[PDB]
């Protein structure tokens, strides 16, 4: 309802803890992700909270308005399109995002859905091939977790 949390795990070294808090009429996303390669990594909400086949069973990006993939500042984007997180030379990425389209309740609620951090940078729907318009060319899912209600 007001606060949520996600613990990111995968088959590699990438781990992290993401916190979500409804503040006013928006949602603030914070936390950190370690064990990444330096550089940008796509960071999205995928539709299902199903981890029966690791991160693969989370499905595509959460997209209740049926739009094409984009960057978080675009009109045309998926609700789950949170852009990229940037890791330092030590593999650490600090997440500090304010997003208008996600919610913690109602139609846009991401509770019970999956947060994924990807292998490569998300090209924000501007790569030029069909895959850019679905995933940003963000590639494999390095770690993920189901978003749960927190105290």
Binding site, annotated residues for Zn(2+): 61, 69, 78, 81
| Stretch of residues binding a copy of itself (CB under 8 A), selected from 34-42, 44-52, 86-94, 117-125 | 44-52
Out of 21, 32, 48, 126, the only residue in the binding site for a copy of itself (CB under 8 A) is: 48
Provide the annotated active-site residues. 44, 46, 61, 69, 78, 81, 118, 141
Nearer to Cu ion, 64 or 90 (CB): 64
Reported as half-sphere exposure (CB side, CA atoms, 13 A), residue 95 has a value of 28
Q: Per-residue x/- mask for a copy of itself, residues 73 to 112, rule CB under 8 A?
A: --------------------------------------xx
Do β-strands 15-23 and 3-8 pair in parallel, antiparallel, or remain unpaired? antiparallel
Nearer to a copy of itself, 48 or 134 (CB): 48
Residues from 16 through 55 that contact Cu ion (CB under 5 A): 44
Q: Residue 116 CB, nearest distance to Cu ion (Å)?
A: 5
Concatenating the DSSP letter of every residue in the chain gives: --EEEEEEB-SSS-EEEEEEEEETTEEEEEEEEESPPSEEEEEEEES----EEEEGGG-SB--TT------TT-SSS-TTEEEEEEE-TTS-EEEEEEESS-BSSSTTB-TTSEEEEESS---TT-SSSTTHHHHTT--SEEEEEE-EE--
Q: Is 145 in the site for a copy of itself (CB under 8 A)?
A: yes
Q: Is 7 in the site for a copy of itself (CB under 8 A)?
A: yes
Residues making contact with Cu ion (CB under 5 A) = 44, 61, 69, 78, 81, 116
């Amino acid at each position: 309802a007001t606060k949520a949390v996600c613990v990111l795990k995968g088959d590699g070294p990438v781990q992290g803890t993401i916190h979500f808090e409804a503040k006013g009429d928006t949602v603030v996303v914070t936390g950190s992700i370690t064990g990444l390669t330096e550089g940008d990594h796509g960071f999205h909400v995928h539709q299902f909270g199903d981890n029966t086949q690791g991160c693969t069973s989370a499905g595509p990006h959460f997209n209740p308005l049926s739009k094409k993939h984009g960057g978080p500042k675009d009109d045309e984007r998926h609700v789950g399109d949170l852009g990229n997180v940037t890791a330092d030379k030590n593999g650490v990425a600090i997440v500090d995002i304010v997003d208008p389209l996600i919610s913690l309740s109602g139609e846009y609620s991401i509770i019970g859905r999956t947060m994924v951090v990807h292998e490569k940078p998300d090209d924000l729907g501007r790569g030029g091939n069909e895959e850019s318009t679905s995933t940003g060319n963000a590639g494999s899912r390095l770690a993920c977790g189901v978003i749960g209600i927190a105290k």
